[PDB]
Design a protein around this ligand. Structure first.
Ligand SMILES: O=C(O)C[C@@H]([C@@H](O)C(=O)O)[N+](=O)[O-]
Ligand code: SF4
Length: 753
């Protein structure tokens, strides 16, 4: 066919649109109906298109991803599991991106230099494991993972998996990009088929066109308020309609990115001329030309059926700001000042932060600079503190060159290193005391309790970078940039003009400094050293195989009330220091979750001593004394980040099962991967029958089977017993993970010993 390389770094790995076409055609001969775009790319990557059972929402698909991307907070545990497998080399193109361990403190270069000293052990481990197993490595300072992927690796029709829940960002270039836990990436790097429950498809028809202050971020802030944080669970969101051509390629990536906050499996846009333009400007005109020849397979079929359809008129959309503690509490910017006032949310904005993978593009920096130059023209600077994260080294070099960085510095901003930084709590914040009630507004995507600064009383609102810039200039949530007046130096009142900016540099991008490190694909005689006394890195010891018995008289470690995100289960911020050390990071287990017994975080009754104390300490006491335990959870347990540490930590501290009203997808898959039992109530009202004092017997594990419920006997202290049924979504592949003790244990059994 054509021999067009997958990227500039892998000149030998060719795009296989011929394979894709071939597979799409096998499947449509079987289904005899129009396929959506996500169905074309997902079913086009089936390991066995001829025999795979395909029912949306019901069958598990065995897929062959094109490439794997990992960032340094999840790559450490994915590579320690890969090192346990004993396999010598990764089977598909794979990269590690170092973006999570650079703490915001001093800004830019000084923070990068410090992170390189402080995190030397970890960066060394990843570069060495990368050289040994054939994984490309983007050095600290390269940029945030999803911006490097859009710029170098994502292309129309790719199926990419990344160990990060915002991997859907790549949907802005027409690929299917899906977030997974480190153990799922091990399957694909190992070469074994990856399984994914066949998605439902929600279609979002965009009409009209964006005007003025409304930006791509407002489309997904509105969709999140409509669908709620659990409304996209088990579905791919497919954007289509005449309004699509009004959005830049990084704008489409912004909308796909935050589809993660409604629990969607991923989001995608059809190949179009804005994508083509972005591919040409990033040195991939040959890939845009090839995609032009295969265009039919890169847009939806005429008349395809969406399981749910939502229509959004871009022309009537207004600026939104979402929060404070959920990203789906959606307010128009024009009303947030009054809802805050009524609700007791602090009205002054202490810090305005632009960045994260969701909004750190060249265009986002240009639109922020366009608001800021107007303030500067009237002798104003930011009333709030203001920080700016460029998404990649290329964007940093180019916004510097094209003058936007100096405008943002002159209004009072501090440019931070090209890294997550304050978005996962890597921020040495000292303007507030812990527990001080305050408001920050960000262009990020999540605003979960204590995630940005570990202060549970910080009220964080997420919005677009141009609205963060306008609110930082005013310093108060009571400011609508569309209607209100600022007062210049000169005494005149003036109004902010809606920002206008180029979506891409007029000249070419400036690449900035060299930050990619190709594997020696020669040498690979690297020994990966993990010191046995390391506090940051620890080799894994396998979990125990299932004993063949039912689980009786299980202790409830904690019955959780309400929202319980993976940031409540395994906090980030200061704990990122231990993402390669299981025993040390297990000390944060469930410290943010609210206990229904007393409505406190990190305070549970130890059943034996009858003292209330920290959840990790109590779990370790139960483990020490042979008491097997359970967590009881409410709805959408495990919402958020893909960090498999939220599943590895309960396994390690002696947990057996997590029984909830519902689970978020990636967390439920991670629980099964680590040999725990994720179970849901067959009647959610049964959550109210279980009291923290009850003991539970899960019965029927001997004939554990797809589609058959398990019985749970609730043993009340007064002698009363009640029996309830619990559902599971295990297929026989996954029951083998549970019988072996983990998926990694099962994989190692299949290596003939
Ligand atoms: O905890 C992690 O490292 C992965 C994660 C992170 O980038 C996050 O935003 O919480 N995520 O979203 O998947
Ligand atoms: S959401 Fe924040 S922490 Fe996660 S990859 Fe994006 S910028 Fe980094």
């Amino acid at each position: 066919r054509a021999k067009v390389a997958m990227s500039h770094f892998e000149p030998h790995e060719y795009i296989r649109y011929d394979l894709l076409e071939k597979n799409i055609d096998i499947v449509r001969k079987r289904l005899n109906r129009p396929l959506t775009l996500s169905e074309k790319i997902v079913y086009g990557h089936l390991d066995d298109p001829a025999n795979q059972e395909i029912e949306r929402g019901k069958t598990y698909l065995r897929l062959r991803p094109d490439r794997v991307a990992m960032q340094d907070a999840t790559a450490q545990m994915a590579m320690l599991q890969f090192i346990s497998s004993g396999l010598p080399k990764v089977a598909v193109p794979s990269t590690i991106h170092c973006d999570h361990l650079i703490e915001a403190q001093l800004g830019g270069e000084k923070d990068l230099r410090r992170a390189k000293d402080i995190n030397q052990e970890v960066y060394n481990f990843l570069a060495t494991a990368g050289a040994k197993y054939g994984v490309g490595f983007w050095r600290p300072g390269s940029g945030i993972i999803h911006q490097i992927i859009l710029e170098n690796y994502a292309y129309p029709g790719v199926l990419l998996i990344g160990t990060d829940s915002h991997t859907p960002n790549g949907g802005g270039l027409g690929g299917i990009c899906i977030g997974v836990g480190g153990a799922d990436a091990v399957d694909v790097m190992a070469g074994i088929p990856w399984e994914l429950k066949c998605p439902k498809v929600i279609g979002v028809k965009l009409t009209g066109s964006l005007s003025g202050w409304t930006s791509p971020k407002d489309v997904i802030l509105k969709v999140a308020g409509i669908l709620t944080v659990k409304g996209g669970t088990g579905a791919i969101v497919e954007y289509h309609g005449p309004g699509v051509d009004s959005i830049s390629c990084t704008g489409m990536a912004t909308i796909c990115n935050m589809g993660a906050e409604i629990g969607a499996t991923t989001s995608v846009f059809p190949y179009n001329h804005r994508m083509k333009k972005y591919l040409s400007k990033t040195g991939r005109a040959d890939i845009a030309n090839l995609a032009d020849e295969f265009k039919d397979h890169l847009v939806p079929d005429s008349g395809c059926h969406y399981d749910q359809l939502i229509e959004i008129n871009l022309s009537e959309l207004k600026p939104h700001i979402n929060g404070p503690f959920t990203p789906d509490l959606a307010h128009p910017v024009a009303e947030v000042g009054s809802v805050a006032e009524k609700e007791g949310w602090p009205l002054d904005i202490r810090v305005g932060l632009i960045g994260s993978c969701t909004n750190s593009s060249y265009e986002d920096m240009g639109r922020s600079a366009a608001v800021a130059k107007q303030a500067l023209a009237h002798g104003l600077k930011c009333k709030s503190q203001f920080t700016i994260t460029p998404g990649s080294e290329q964007i940093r070099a180019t916004i510097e060159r094209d003058g936007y960085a100096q405008v943002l510095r002159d209004v009072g901003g501090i440019v931070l290193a090209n890294a997550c930084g304050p978005c996962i709590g890597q921020w040495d914040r000292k303007d507030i005391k812990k527990g001080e009630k305050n408001t920050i507004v960000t262009s990020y995507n999540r605003n979960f309790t204590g995630r940005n600064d570990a202060n549970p009383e910080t009220h964080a609102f997420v919005t677009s970078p141009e609205i963060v810039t306008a609110l930082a200039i005013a310093g108060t949530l009571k400011f609508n940039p569309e209607t209100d007046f600022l007062t210049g130096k000169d005494g005149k009142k003036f109004k902010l003009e809606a920002p206008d900016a180029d979506e891409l540099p007029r000249a070419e991008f400036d690449p900035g400094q060299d930050t990619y490190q190709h594997p020696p694909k020669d040498s690979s005689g690297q020994r990966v050293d993990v010191s046995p006394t390391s506090q940051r890195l620890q080799l894994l010891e396998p979990f125990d195989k299932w004993d063949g018995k039912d689980l009786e008289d299980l202790q409830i470690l904690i019955k959780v009330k309400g929202k319980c995100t993976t940031d409540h289960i395994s906090a980030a911020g200061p704990w990122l220091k231990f993402r390669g050390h299981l025993d040390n990071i297990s000390n944060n287990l469930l410290i943010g979750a609210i206990n229904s017994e007393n409505r406190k975080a990190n305070s549970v009754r130890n059943a034996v001593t009858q003292e209330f104390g920290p959840v990790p300490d109590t779990a370790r006491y139960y483990k020490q004394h042979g008491i097997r335990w359970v967590v009881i959870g409410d709805e959408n347990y495990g919402e958020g980040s893909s960090r498999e540490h939220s599943a590895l930590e309960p396994r390690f501290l002696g947990g057996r099962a997590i029984i909830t009203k519902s689970f978020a997808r990636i967390h439920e898959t991670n629980l099964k991967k680590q040999g725990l039992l994720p179970l849901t109530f067959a009647d959610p009202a049964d959550y109210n029958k279980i009291h923290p004092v009850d003991k539970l017997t899960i019965q029927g594990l001997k004939d554990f089977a797809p589609g058959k419920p398990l019985t749970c006997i609730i043993k009340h202290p007064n002698g009363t017993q009640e029996t309830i049924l619990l559902n599971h979504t295990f297929n026989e592949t996954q029951i083998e993970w549970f019988r072996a003790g983990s998926a990694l244990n099962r994989m190692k059994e299949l290596q003939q010993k």
